[PDB]
């Protein structure tokens, strides 16, 4: 029968929807957790290749 994923997860056709924005922390929406250095301990995301540092 026809249905949506709200009623049961068996009706959901989206396995995983990766969602990201601002690969660099320009907007300061996240305060990075660090021990000694904050830029060398957090891996650089791939989408950082599409924005100016």
């Amino acid at each position: 029968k026809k249905g949506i994923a709200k009623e049961h997860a068996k009706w959901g056709p989206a396995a995983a929807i990766e969602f990201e924005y601002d690969p660099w922390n320009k907007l300061k929406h996240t305060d990075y957790w660090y021990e000694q250095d904050s830029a060398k301990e957090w891996p650089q995301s791939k989408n950082c290749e599409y924005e100016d540092p």
Binding site: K1, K2, G3, H8, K10, P13
Partner: protein, 53 residues
């Protein structure tokens, strides 16, 4: 069901099988269909017959 699996176990596994739904917009919801538990314009009937020969 002579199998070593429970009926509801197999039913749950069947419910999770992805089925083609490209033309889902043409079918009607069960709640909105002037029909019964099964029909042709609000549901699709499948049959599984297996034997361990």
């Amino acid at each position: 069901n002579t199998t070593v699996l429970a009926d509801e176990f197999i039913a749950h596994r069947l419910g999770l099988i992805p089925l083609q739904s490209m033309d889902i917009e043409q079918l009607e919801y069960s709640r909105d269909c002037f029909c019964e538990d099964h029909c042709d314009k609000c549901s699709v009937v499948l049959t599984l017959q297996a034997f361990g020969e």
